[PDB]
Amino acid sequence: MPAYACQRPTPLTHHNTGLSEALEILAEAAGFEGSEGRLLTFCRAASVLKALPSPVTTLSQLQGLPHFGEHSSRVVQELLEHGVCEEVERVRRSERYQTMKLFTQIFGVGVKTADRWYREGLRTLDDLREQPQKLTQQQKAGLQHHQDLSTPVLRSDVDALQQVVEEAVGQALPGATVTLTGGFRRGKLQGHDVDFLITHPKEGQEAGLLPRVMCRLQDQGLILYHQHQHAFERSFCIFRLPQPGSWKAVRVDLVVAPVSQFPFALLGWTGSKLFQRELRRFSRKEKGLWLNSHGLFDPEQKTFFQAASEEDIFRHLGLEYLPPEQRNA
Ligand SMILES: O=c1ccn([C@@H]2O[C@H](COP(=O)(O)OP(=O)(O)OP(=O)(O)O)[C@@H](O)[C@H]2O)c(=O)[nH]1
Ligand SMILES: [Mn+2]
Ligand SMILES: [Mn+2]
């Protein structure tokens, strides 16, 4: 099995979910403590298990796998022998981890904000609501809707949202396209948000499209929150999704890219986050090119690669093409 996650298929469903879940708790906890090296190490080990064709029943099956050092091996050994890993259970039970998870899950809260709040003695959602001067407007909106935003977004929600976004995009600008990206493009059945990439086949015709889209959605009562950012033009939103007898707040990211950059933006926004990190590391370390959501830059020659498709980018980097459902690293 090759070293980089971008050199191997990682399907949606696999045979090692208990083990990968435990390593990913340790990765997340590492990130909460600012231990970025350890985060990446645990994330990589978990992603190896996701790519295996069979369940790991005994530790022999570890043999020959890259990115499976002593610590990750130890964790798996304890799970196989004892059905539980004490380091993992202590993390689960810890107030620090529980609170960092609570806070960072809220819309508009990252690790540094969550850690600051923790160090200042804040622990609960009510504690945050008692200190509104400490909150950004985005965070206030995340708190207002936290129950719905903690509820997994379903494929059925995605289909309804794609319909209203497509309708608004179509009415504002005939010819403009909407592409579902993120985890749902990778085949996921559930998610934390819905990601859309908007473009138009004529370069420049995408200008000013997003505010017209947003006006249309707002006048239908579909928007609870939006923050328009002029990097790609993007609106990070909370939609009010109608449902039978009720409604549901749902996070939606709308990203506009000029068509020349579309393949790079689709690649970046499709993920997984680890897949894309690995693809960028591969591009730099193995091919000496700098990949991002806007392009593929050769820093020696000072050149940008022209791509019409994701397949072009994979081909140019000397990688076998992986469709989005095999990017679940
Ligand atoms: O601001 C951003 C946010 C996200 N992304 C990139 O967009 C992709 C989607 O980012 P998400 O955070 O939506 O992840 P996801 O769809 O894979 O997972 P769930 O919603 O199911 O939890 C990931 O590859 C991420 O790196 C950006 O490039 N920029
Ligand atoms: Mn997403
Ligand atoms: Mn998103």
Coordinates of C-alpha atoms and ligand atoms in Angstrom, one line a residue:
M1 CA 0.0 0.0 0.0
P2 CA 1.5 3.3 -1.1
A3 CA 2.6 6.1 1.3
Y4 CA 0.4 9.0 0.2
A5 CA -3.4 8.8 0.5
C6 CA -3.6 10.3 -3.0
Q7 CA -1.8 7.2 -4.4
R8 CA -4.5 4.8 -3.2
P9 CA -8.3 4.5 -3.2
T10 CA -10.0 5.0 0.1
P11 CA -13.7 4.1 -0.2
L12 CA -16.6 5.5 1.8
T13 CA -17.2 2.3 3.8
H14 CA -14.5 0.1 5.3
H15 CA -13.7 -2.7 7.7
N16 CA -11.9 -1.0 10.6
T17 CA -14.2 1.7 11.8
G18 CA -13.7 1.1 15.5
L19 CA -9.9 1.4 15.1
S20 CA -9.9 4.4 12.8
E21 CA -12.4 6.2 15.1
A22 CA -10.1 5.7 18.1
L23 CA -7.0 7.0 16.3
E24 CA -9.0 10.0 15.0
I25 CA -10.0 10.8 18.6
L26 CA -6.3 11.0 19.5
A27 CA -5.7 13.1 16.3
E28 CA -8.4 15.5 17.2
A29 CA -7.2 15.8 20.8
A30 CA -3.7 16.5 19.5
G31 CA -5.1 19.4 17.4
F32 CA -6.9 20.8 20.4
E33 CA -3.5 21.0 22.2
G34 CA -1.8 22.6 19.2
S35 CA 0.2 19.4 18.5
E36 CA 0.0 19.5 14.7
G37 CA 2.7 16.8 14.0
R38 CA 0.9 14.3 16.2
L39 CA -2.5 15.2 14.6
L40 CA -1.1 14.4 11.1
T41 CA 0.5 11.2 12.3
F42 CA -2.7 9.8 13.9
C43 CA -4.8 11.0 10.9
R44 CA -2.4 9.2 8.5
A45 CA -2.5 5.9 10.5
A46 CA -6.3 6.1 10.6
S47 CA -6.4 6.6 6.8
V48 CA -4.3 3.5 6.3
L49 CA -6.9 1.4 8.1
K50 CA -9.6 2.8 5.9
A51 CA -7.8 1.6 2.8
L52 CA -7.4 -2.0 4.0
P53 CA -9.5 -4.6 2.3
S54 CA -10.2 -6.7 5.4
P55 CA -10.8 -6.2 9.1
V56 CA -7.7 -6.1 11.4
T57 CA -8.4 -9.0 13.8
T58 CA -4.8 -9.6 15.1
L59 CA -1.8 -7.2 15.2
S60 CA 0.1 -9.3 12.5
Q61 CA -2.0 -7.6 9.9
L62 CA -0.2 -4.3 10.7
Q63 CA 2.9 -5.8 9.0
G64 CA 4.3 -3.7 6.1
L65 CA 1.9 -0.8 6.4
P66 CA 3.4 2.8 6.2
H67 CA 2.6 5.5 8.7
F68 CA 2.0 3.0 11.5
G69 CA 4.5 3.9 14.2
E70 CA 4.8 2.6 17.7
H71 CA 2.1 4.9 19.2
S72 CA -0.7 4.0 16.7
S73 CA 0.3 0.3 16.8
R74 CA 0.1 0.4 20.6
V75 CA -3.4 1.9 20.5
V76 CA -4.6 -0.8 18.0
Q77 CA -2.9 -3.5 20.1
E78 CA -4.9 -2.5 23.3
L79 CA -8.2 -2.4 21.3
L80 CA -7.6 -5.9 19.9
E81 CA -6.5 -7.4 23.2
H82 CA -8.7 -5.6 25.7
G83 CA -11.6 -4.1 23.7
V84 CA -10.7 -0.6 24.9
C85 CA -7.7 1.7 24.9
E86 CA -7.2 3.6 28.2
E87 CA -5.5 6.6 26.6
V88 CA -8.5 7.0 24.3
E89 CA -11.0 6.6 27.1
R90 CA -9.2 9.2 29.2
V91 CA -9.4 11.6 26.3
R92 CA -13.1 10.9 25.9
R93 CA -13.8 11.5 29.6
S94 CA -11.7 14.6 29.9
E95 CA -13.3 18.0 30.5
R96 CA -10.7 19.6 28.2
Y97 CA -11.5 17.4 25.3
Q98 CA -15.3 17.5 25.8
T99 CA -15.3 21.3 26.1
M100 CA -12.9 21.8 23.1
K101 CA -15.2 19.5 21.1
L102 CA -18.3 21.4 22.3
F103 CA -16.9 24.8 21.4
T104 CA -15.1 24.0 18.1
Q105 CA -18.2 22.3 16.7
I106 CA -20.0 25.7 16.9
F107 CA -20.2 27.6 13.6
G108 CA -17.5 30.2 13.4
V109 CA -15.4 28.8 16.3
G110 CA -11.9 27.4 15.7
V111 CA -9.3 25.8 18.0
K112 CA -7.6 29.1 19.1
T113 CA -11.0 30.7 20.0
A114 CA -12.2 27.5 21.8
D115 CA -8.9 27.2 23.7
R116 CA -9.0 30.9 24.7
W117 CA -12.5 30.4 26.1
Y118 CA -11.4 27.3 27.9
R119 CA -8.5 29.1 29.5
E120 CA -10.9 31.9 30.6
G121 CA -13.1 29.4 32.4
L122 CA -15.9 29.0 29.9
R123 CA -17.4 25.4 29.7
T124 CA -20.9 25.4 28.4
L125 CA -23.1 26.8 25.7
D126 CA -24.9 28.8 28.4
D127 CA -21.6 30.2 29.6
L128 CA -21.1 31.6 26.0
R129 CA -24.6 33.1 25.9
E130 CA -23.9 34.9 29.2
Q131 CA -20.9 36.6 27.5
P132 CA -22.3 37.9 24.2
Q133 CA -19.6 40.6 23.9
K134 CA -17.1 37.7 23.5
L135 CA -18.9 36.4 20.4
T136 CA -18.8 37.3 16.8
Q137 CA -22.0 37.6 14.9
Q138 CA -21.3 34.3 13.1
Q139 CA -20.8 32.6 16.5
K140 CA -24.0 34.1 17.8
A141 CA -25.8 32.6 14.9
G142 CA -24.0 29.3 15.4
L143 CA -25.3 29.3 19.0
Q144 CA -28.8 30.3 18.1
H145 CA -29.0 27.3 15.8
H146 CA -26.7 24.9 17.5
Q147 CA -29.1 22.0 18.0
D148 CA -30.0 21.9 14.3
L149 CA -26.3 22.4 13.2
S150 CA -25.3 19.4 15.4
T151 CA -27.9 17.3 13.6
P152 CA -26.3 15.4 10.6
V153 CA -27.2 16.8 7.3
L154 CA -28.9 14.1 5.1
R155 CA -28.8 13.4 1.4
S156 CA -32.5 14.4 1.3
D157 CA -31.6 17.8 2.7
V158 CA -28.8 18.2 0.1
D159 CA -31.2 17.4 -2.7
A160 CA -33.7 20.0 -1.5
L161 CA -31.0 22.6 -1.0
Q162 CA -29.4 21.9 -4.4
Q163 CA -32.8 22.5 -6.0
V164 CA -33.2 26.0 -4.4
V165 CA -29.6 27.0 -5.1
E166 CA -29.9 25.8 -8.7
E167 CA -33.2 27.7 -9.1
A168 CA -31.7 30.9 -7.8
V169 CA -28.5 30.6 -9.8
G170 CA -30.5 29.8 -13.0
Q171 CA -32.9 32.7 -12.5
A172 CA -30.0 35.2 -11.8
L173 CA -27.9 34.0 -14.6
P174 CA -28.9 31.6 -17.4
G175 CA -25.9 29.4 -18.2
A176 CA -24.4 29.4 -14.7
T177 CA -23.8 26.0 -13.1
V178 CA -24.0 24.6 -9.6
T179 CA -21.8 21.7 -8.6
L180 CA -22.2 19.7 -5.3
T181 CA -18.8 19.3 -3.7
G182 CA -17.5 18.3 -0.2
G183 CA -18.3 15.0 1.4
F184 CA -21.6 14.5 -0.5
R185 CA -19.7 14.5 -3.8
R186 CA -17.5 11.8 -2.2
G187 CA -20.6 9.6 -1.7
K188 CA -21.2 10.4 2.0
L189 CA -24.7 9.8 3.3
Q190 CA -24.5 12.5 5.9
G191 CA -22.4 15.7 6.6
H192 CA -21.9 18.8 8.7
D193 CA -22.8 21.2 5.9
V194 CA -23.5 21.2 2.1
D195 CA -20.8 22.6 -0.2
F196 CA -21.6 24.1 -3.7
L197 CA -19.2 25.5 -6.3
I198 CA -20.7 27.9 -8.8
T199 CA -19.3 29.1 -12.1
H200 CA -20.2 30.1 -15.7
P201 CA -18.5 28.8 -18.9
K202 CA -17.6 32.4 -20.0
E203 CA -14.8 33.8 -17.8
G204 CA -16.0 37.0 -16.0
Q205 CA -19.7 36.3 -16.4
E206 CA -19.6 34.9 -12.7
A207 CA -18.9 38.5 -11.5
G208 CA -21.7 39.8 -9.1
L209 CA -23.6 36.5 -9.4
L210 CA -23.4 35.5 -5.8
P211 CA -25.1 38.6 -4.3
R212 CA -28.0 38.1 -6.8
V213 CA -28.3 34.5 -5.8
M214 CA -28.3 35.5 -2.2
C215 CA -31.0 38.2 -2.7
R216 CA -33.2 35.6 -4.4
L217 CA -32.7 33.1 -1.6
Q218 CA -33.3 35.7 1.1
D219 CA -36.6 36.9 -0.5
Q220 CA -37.8 33.3 -0.3
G221 CA -37.3 33.1 3.5
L222 CA -34.5 30.6 3.0
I223 CA -31.6 32.4 4.7
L224 CA -31.0 32.7 8.5
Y225 CA -27.4 33.9 8.3
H226 CA -25.0 34.8 5.6
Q227 CA -21.5 36.3 5.5
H228 CA -20.4 37.4 2.1
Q229 CA -16.6 37.5 1.6
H230 CA -15.0 39.1 -1.4
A231 CA -9.5 34.0 -2.5
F232 CA -12.8 33.0 -4.1
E233 CA -15.9 35.0 -3.6
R234 CA -17.8 32.9 -1.0
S235 CA -20.8 33.1 1.3
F236 CA -20.9 30.9 4.4
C237 CA -24.5 30.6 5.2
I238 CA -27.2 29.0 7.5
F239 CA -30.2 28.1 5.4
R240 CA -33.7 27.6 6.8
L241 CA -34.7 24.3 5.2
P242 CA -38.5 23.7 5.2
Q243 CA -39.5 20.1 6.2
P244 CA -42.8 18.4 6.5
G245 CA -44.4 20.2 9.6
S246 CA -41.2 22.0 10.6
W247 CA -37.9 23.4 9.5
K248 CA -34.2 22.8 10.0
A249 CA -31.2 25.1 10.0
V250 CA -28.4 23.8 7.7
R251 CA -25.0 25.1 7.0
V252 CA -24.3 25.8 3.3
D253 CA -21.0 27.0 1.8
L254 CA -21.4 28.8 -1.6
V255 CA -18.2 29.3 -3.5
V256 CA -17.8 31.1 -6.8
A257 CA -14.8 30.3 -9.1
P258 CA -13.9 31.6 -12.5
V259 CA -14.1 28.8 -15.0
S260 CA -10.3 28.7 -15.6
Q261 CA -9.9 27.8 -11.9
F262 CA -12.9 25.5 -11.6
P263 CA -11.0 22.2 -11.8
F264 CA -8.6 23.3 -9.0
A265 CA -11.5 24.5 -6.9
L266 CA -13.5 21.4 -7.4
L267 CA -10.5 19.3 -6.4
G268 CA -9.8 21.3 -3.3
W269 CA -13.4 21.6 -2.2
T270 CA -14.2 17.9 -2.8
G271 CA -11.7 16.7 -0.1
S272 CA -11.4 14.8 2.0
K273 CA -9.4 17.4 4.1
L274 CA -6.7 14.7 4.6
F275 CA -6.7 13.7 0.9
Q276 CA -6.1 17.3 -0.2
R277 CA -3.4 17.8 2.4
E278 CA -1.7 14.6 1.1
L279 CA -2.2 15.6 -2.5
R280 CA -0.5 19.0 -1.9
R281 CA 2.3 17.4 0.1
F282 CA 2.8 14.9 -2.7
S283 CA 2.8 17.6 -5.4
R284 CA 5.5 19.7 -3.5
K285 CA 7.7 16.9 -2.3
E286 CA 7.5 14.4 -5.2
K287 CA 6.9 16.8 -8.2
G288 CA 8.1 20.2 -7.0
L289 CA 4.8 21.9 -7.8
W290 CA 2.6 24.0 -5.5
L291 CA -1.0 22.9 -5.6
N292 CA -3.9 24.9 -4.2
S293 CA -7.6 25.5 -4.9
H294 CA -6.7 28.1 -7.5
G295 CA -4.0 26.4 -9.5
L296 CA -0.9 24.3 -9.9
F297 CA 2.3 26.5 -9.8
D298 CA 5.8 25.6 -10.9
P299 CA 8.0 27.8 -8.6
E300 CA 11.2 27.3 -10.7
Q301 CA 9.6 28.2 -14.1
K302 CA 7.0 30.6 -12.7
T303 CA 4.2 28.9 -14.6
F304 CA 0.6 27.9 -13.9
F305 CA -0.8 24.6 -15.3
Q306 CA -3.9 24.9 -17.6
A307 CA -6.5 22.2 -16.6
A308 CA -9.9 21.6 -18.0
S309 CA -10.7 18.8 -15.5
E310 CA -9.6 17.0 -12.3
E311 CA -8.3 14.2 -14.5
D312 CA -5.8 16.7 -16.2
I313 CA -4.4 17.6 -12.7
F314 CA -4.0 14.0 -11.6
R315 CA -2.4 13.2 -15.0
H316 CA 0.0 16.2 -14.7
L317 CA 1.1 15.1 -11.2
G318 CA 1.7 11.5 -12.4
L319 CA -1.1 10.0 -10.3
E320 CA -3.7 7.5 -11.4
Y321 CA -7.1 9.2 -11.4
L322 CA -9.2 8.7 -8.3
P323 CA -13.0 9.5 -8.6
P324 CA -14.4 11.4 -5.6
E325 CA -15.8 8.3 -3.9
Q326 CA -12.2 7.0 -3.5
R327 CA -10.9 10.2 -1.9
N328 CA -12.4 9.4 1.6
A329 CA -8.9 9.5 3.3
Ligands
LIG1 O1 -12.7 27.4 3.9 C1 -12.6 26.2 3.4 C2 -13.4 25.2 3.9 C3 -13.2 23.9 3.4 N1 -12.3 23.7 2.4 C4 -12.2 22.3 1.8 O2 -13.4 21.9 1.3 C5 -13.6 20.5 1.5 C6 -14.9 20.3 2.2 O3 -14.8 20.9 3.5 P1 -15.8 20.4 4.7 O4 -15.3 21.0 6.0 O5 -17.3 20.8 4.3 O6 -15.6 18.8 4.8 P2 -16.5 17.6 4.2 O7 -17.6 18.2 3.2 O8 -15.5 16.7 3.6 O9 -17.1 17.0 5.5 P3 -18.5 17.1 6.3 O10 -19.1 18.4 5.7 O11 -19.3 15.9 6.0 O12 -18.1 17.2 7.7 C7 -12.3 20.0 2.3 O13 -11.4 19.4 1.4 C8 -11.8 21.3 2.9 O14 -10.4 21.3 3.0 C9 -11.5 24.8 1.9 O15 -10.7 24.6 1.0 N2 -11.7 26.0 2.4
MN2 MN -18.9 19.7 3.7
MN3 MN -18.0 23.4 4.0

